[PDB]
Amino acid sequence: KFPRVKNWELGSITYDTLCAQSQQDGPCTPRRCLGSLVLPRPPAEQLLSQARDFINQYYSSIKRSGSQAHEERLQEVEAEVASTGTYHLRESELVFGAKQAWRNAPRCVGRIQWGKLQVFDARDCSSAQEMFTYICNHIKYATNRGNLRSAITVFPQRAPGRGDFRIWNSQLVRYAGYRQQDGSVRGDPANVEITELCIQHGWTPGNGRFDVLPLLLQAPDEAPELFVLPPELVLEVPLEHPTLEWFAALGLRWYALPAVSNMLLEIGGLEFSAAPFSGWYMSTEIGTRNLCDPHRYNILEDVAVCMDLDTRTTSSLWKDKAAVEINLAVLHSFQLAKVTIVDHHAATVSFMKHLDNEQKARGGCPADWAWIVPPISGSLTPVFHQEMVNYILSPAFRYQPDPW
Amino acid sequence: GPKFPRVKNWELGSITYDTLCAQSQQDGPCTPRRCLGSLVLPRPPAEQLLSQARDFINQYYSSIKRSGSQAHEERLQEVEAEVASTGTYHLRESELVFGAKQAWRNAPRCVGRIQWGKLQVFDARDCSSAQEMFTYICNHIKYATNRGNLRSAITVFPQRAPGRGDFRIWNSQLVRYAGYRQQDGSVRGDPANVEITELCIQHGWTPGNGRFDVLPLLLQAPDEAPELFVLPPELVLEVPLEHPTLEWFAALGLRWYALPAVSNMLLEIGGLEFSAAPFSGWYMSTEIGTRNLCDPHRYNILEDVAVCMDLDTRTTSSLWKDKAAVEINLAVLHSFQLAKVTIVDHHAATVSFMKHLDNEQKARGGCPADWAWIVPPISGSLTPVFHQEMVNYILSPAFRYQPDPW
Numbered sequence A: 001k002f003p004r005v006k007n008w009e010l011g012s013i014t015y016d017t018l019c020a021q022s023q024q025d026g027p028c029t030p031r032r033c034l035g036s037l038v039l040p041r042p043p044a045e046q047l048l049s050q051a052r053d054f055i056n057q058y059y060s061s062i063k064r065s066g067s068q069a070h071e072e073r074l075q076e077v078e079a080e081v082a083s084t085g086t087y088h089l090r091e092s093e094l095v096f097g098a099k100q101a102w103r104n105a106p107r108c109v110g111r112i113q114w115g116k117l118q119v120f121d122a123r124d125c126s127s128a129q130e131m132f133t134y135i136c137n138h139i140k141y142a143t144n145r146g147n148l149r150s151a152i153t154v155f156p157q158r159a160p161g162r163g164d165f166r167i168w169n170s171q172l173v174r175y176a177g178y179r180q181q182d183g184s185v186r187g188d189p190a191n192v193e194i195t196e197l198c199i200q201h202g203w204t205p206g207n208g209r210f211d212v213l214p215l216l217l218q219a220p221d222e223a224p225e226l227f228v229l230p231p232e233l234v235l236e237v238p239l240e241h242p243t244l245e246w247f248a249a250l251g252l253r254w255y256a257l258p259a260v261s262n263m264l265l266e267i268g269g270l271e272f273s274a275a276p277f278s279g280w281y282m283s284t285e286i287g288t289r290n291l292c293d294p295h296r297y298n299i300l301e302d303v304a305v306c307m308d309l310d311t312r313t314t315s316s317l318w319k320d321k322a323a324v325e326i327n328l329a330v331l332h333s334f335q336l337a338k339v340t341i342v343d344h345h346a347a348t349v350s351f352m353k354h355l356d357n358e359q360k361a362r363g364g365c366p367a368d369w370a371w372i373v374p375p376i377s378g379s380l381t382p383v384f385h386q387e388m389v390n391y392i393l394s395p396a397f398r399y400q401p402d403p404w
Numbered sequence B: 001g002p003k004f005p006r007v008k009n010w011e012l013g014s015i016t017y018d019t020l021c022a023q024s025q026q027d028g029p030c031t032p033r034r035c036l037g038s039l040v041l042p043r044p045p046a047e048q049l050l051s052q053a054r055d056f057i058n059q060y061y062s063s064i065k066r067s068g069s070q071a072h073e074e075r076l077q078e079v080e081a082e083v084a085s086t087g088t089y090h091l092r093e094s095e096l097v098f099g100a101k102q103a104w105r106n107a108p109r110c111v112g113r114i115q116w117g118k119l120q121v122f123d124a125r126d127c128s129s130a131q132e133m134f135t136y137i138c139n140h141i142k143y144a145t146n147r148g149n150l151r152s153a154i155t156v157f158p159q160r161a162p163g164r165g166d167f168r169i170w171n172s173q174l175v176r177y178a179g180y181r182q183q184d185g186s187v188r189g190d191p192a193n194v195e196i197t198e199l200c201i202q203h204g205w206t207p208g209n210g211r212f213d214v215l216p217l218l219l220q221a222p223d224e225a226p227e228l229f230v231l232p233p234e235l236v237l238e239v240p241l242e243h244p245t246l247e248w249f250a251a252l253g254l255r256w257y258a259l260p261a262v263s264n265m266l267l268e269i270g271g272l273e274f275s276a277a278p279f280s281g282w283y284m285s286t287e288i289g290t291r292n293l294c295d296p297h298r299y300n301i302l303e304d305v306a307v308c309m310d311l312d313t314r315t316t317s318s319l320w321k322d323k324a325a326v327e328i329n330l331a332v333l334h335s336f337q338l339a340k341v342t343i344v345d346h347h348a349a350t351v352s353f354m355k356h357l358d359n360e361q362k363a364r365g366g367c368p369a370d371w372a373w374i375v376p377p378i379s380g381s382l383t384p385v386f387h388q389e390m391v392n393y394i395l396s397p398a399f400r401y402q403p404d405p406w
């Protein structure tokens, strides 16, 4: 029942016992494994049970399980759900749950920081305009002049028979994707749909490759509202290469703050449909995926032709050589600009530590191998040689339907 | 919509549904509770063998388009008779050829399956001694190597018999470099082969002291201790490694063999188990340049090469491991090309595996694949497989790891 988890670079071995705590099901069955798939294909009792577990998790955290404070807080929850069908979290319990959801994110390689998370309580939000203020503050705090600080702002929980508070953008800061005449796309191809919704909603579009998009914020059962972000609020890094003087002339650049905003935060059965978070970028996200995915800026061939590689045959490894300089350009530029960034070697080594801290702490750590291993130089990182067990622990961050 | 796993490619946005998984009859290591997809090692009564056999025979007649015919019903009759009075049974020539190819085709961890139909099957179920085994292997190596223009092949030795001992090739590959345990604790040669090297010596092998000494073979006929056989040097083709523009790389003295001949996997067909059945095709560029040469627990030449390239190896952020690994891989590719030895880089290899997925989609409605093994150890998202969701499941015939004989 309990999985033997071996590391093939050091021969070490551990046994994940934490997985027993998983209450929800994944996509795999003995018949077949769907671990590489990206996406997955309330009764007072159901909710009440999730709540109980959460509160028990909280009091155990403050090392006061079974105490008076515990017993009474459990009754409050019972009382509220029994009469209203739902309940609410106390700011401290929320702070704990947020850190925990991050702690349980199988796809996050930066979890060595899970304990250092600034939680903003925005549950007293009744309008989109109010959401925008909270967001504008999350950004100022989070960015901190280039010295990034992990943070999350939490908006009103979902409610039976009432629309969701949502941030239509998958990230607080993103570059527009402008479909053009010849099926072409100027900018970030992954953001075409949202850039179009922004237009149909009255935004006056630009024509740059890196035009920061406006936010479509939506308060319950109301049409989304467009809000433009103060340019000086959006810290960005121009990319230049340490030795290739011609790199800078490509005009490439990327924003400093990675703030996911399309995910749902679930804590004790309660669902928070709008709870943007942000820590800091790992260089490959920008250097490998964002700039080199064939369905993103797809700049691989350009940079290679620049370097003067033989982009005529796969055997010259021009793709591999270009990819590395671009990642080097990112790491160099963020350091030059004094903005928090972490390379993939540094990051994965730290994640290796996290795995160890968690083994002693909880008896395991849920991890999605395909996501933890970097998009380049996989086996050159420790995590590649590390076996992992993936499963669902709550508090958790889940994906949710786009509100349109 | 469709009631089977929905499979998506996130680069092109295309979708398919895997219906082939429905044919699997062996449970994997995952459960709805947790995914053990990243684990390397996932932890007969006539009745069981009979049905396994029936399934295989059906698969074969199915492949030739005579499913349900008289010849089909007779063969099934035959296998049942034989199993009825002997406990086991034998495969016909063409049945073994079919099964060996399906086993390769069904292998979830092989990125080179586009070549599955083009495998030369050498039948050796008549082999009776360890010496004959050596001869069989020498022919395989000779034909398979074909002077640098490699040809996929597999030599199948006698299936396991009830009670009777197994035929086994102790070495994990027909060609492997010795791993010498040092005084200072380090290992000279390939760290991976430390034990088989220690076993070769315990059996009378006179060791060398280099980093690229070819191990001798420890072959084992039923119920006998393994005999030691040394491969004649002329039969083992090697490629001295050199970089195309870094002139000093050639001075590093790195080299690798051309024939990747896995030799300790069990080939299971219709319930029958072939404990010895060496197969070989050709290397994928990154197998040597990234894993064998740069793994921390293998040759680990990463720092050396970086120092030669004068890279700042004091900080992770200089991407010195990344720059070096690229060059080492390019050297592997450059040296095999120059020496006219067959090899395929991670890019072409993965483009061809995409084409294979497409072929298999149309042919069987699915292709079992191990994402972690399909996606290369370097430049993952630069290859198309990375963006391809894959379903993993066990189909038979198939290759399986098996316990080391000793």
Ligand code: HEM
Pocket (backbone or CB within 6 Å): A098, A102, A105, A107, A108, A109, A110, A111, A113, A117, A150, A151, A152, A260, A263, A277, A278, A279, A280, A281, A282, A285, A342, A347, A371, A397
């Ligand atoms: C402080 C530095 C942090 C680093 C270096 C880091 C890095 C990463 C990386 C590499 C990924 C995968 C990104 C991708 O491929 O799209 C990831 C995923 C994730 N991270 Fe972290 N993380 C950090 C902070 C955070 C914070 C503060 C939270 C939450 C409070 C968080 C929640 C998650 C979640 C939920 C995922 C999955 C995203 C998805 O499915 O699209 N991370 N992280």
Ligand code: HEM
Pocket (backbone or CB within 6 Å): B100, B104, B107, B109, B110, B111, B112, B113, B115, B119, B152, B153, B154, B262, B265, B279, B280, B281, B282, B283, B284, B287, B344, B349, B373, B399
């Ligand atoms: C035509 C050239 C071929 C190429 C380029 C190819 C490539 C590969 C690669 C890259 C791997 C993973 C290596 C590793 O990570 O250790 C692999 C694994 C495998 N291949 Fe292929 N292959 C080829 C031919 C063959 C042949 C002829 C067979 C068998 C009849 C085959 C059966 C397998 C099996 C069973 C595995 C998994 C082995 C294991 O679990 O260690 N391959 N192949």
Ligand SMILES: N=C(NCCC[C@@H](NC(=O)[C@H](N)CCCCN)C(N)=O)NN(O)O
Pocket (backbone or CB within 6 Å): A039, A170, A171, A258, A259, A260, A261, A277, A278, A279, A280, A281, A282, A285, A399, A400
């Ligand atoms: N440094 C990070 N990185 C996490 C980045 C997550 C990224 N996900 C993606 O781009 C997914 N492919 C979107 C999948 C949504 C489909 N439901 C996104 N939403 O921008 N985090 N910090 O907080 O620091």
Ligand SMILES: N=C(NCCC[C@@H](NC(=O)[C@H](N)CCCCN)C(N)=O)NN(O)O
Pocket (backbone or CB within 6 Å): B041, B172, B173, B260, B261, B262, B263, B279, B280, B281, B282, B283, B284, B287, B401, B402
């Ligand atoms: N190009 C290839 N490559 C196949 C390489 C497979 C490799 N596996 C390994 O080294 C596993 N880690 C060993 C698993 C043992 C588990 N007991 C091995 N045995 O040498 N094939 N052909 O071209 O045929």
Ligand SMILES: C[C@H](O)[C@H](O)[C@H]1CNc2nc(N)[nH]c(=O)c2N1
Pocket (backbone or CB within 6 Å): A036, A037, A038, A370, A371, A372, A373, B010, B386, B387, B388, B389, B390
């Ligand atoms: C299909 C495959 O699961 C998909 O491309 C995954 C692979 N690994 C990943 N790893 C990270 N960090 N981020 C991703 O988006 C992905 N995408």
Ligand SMILES: C[C@H](O)[C@H](O)[C@H]1CNc2nc(N)[nH]c(=O)c2N1
Pocket (backbone or CB within 6 Å): A008, A384, A385, A386, A387, A388, B038, B039, B040, B372, B373, B374
């Ligand atoms: C722990 C993890 O499963 C292990 O390092 C796997 C990852 N992917 C691999 N992929 C291939 N082709 N070969 C390997 O040996 C591995 N090792």
Ligand SMILES: [Zn+2]
Pocket (backbone or CB within 6 Å): A028, A032, A033, A034, A035, B030, B034, B035, B036, B037
């Ligand atoms: Zn799985």
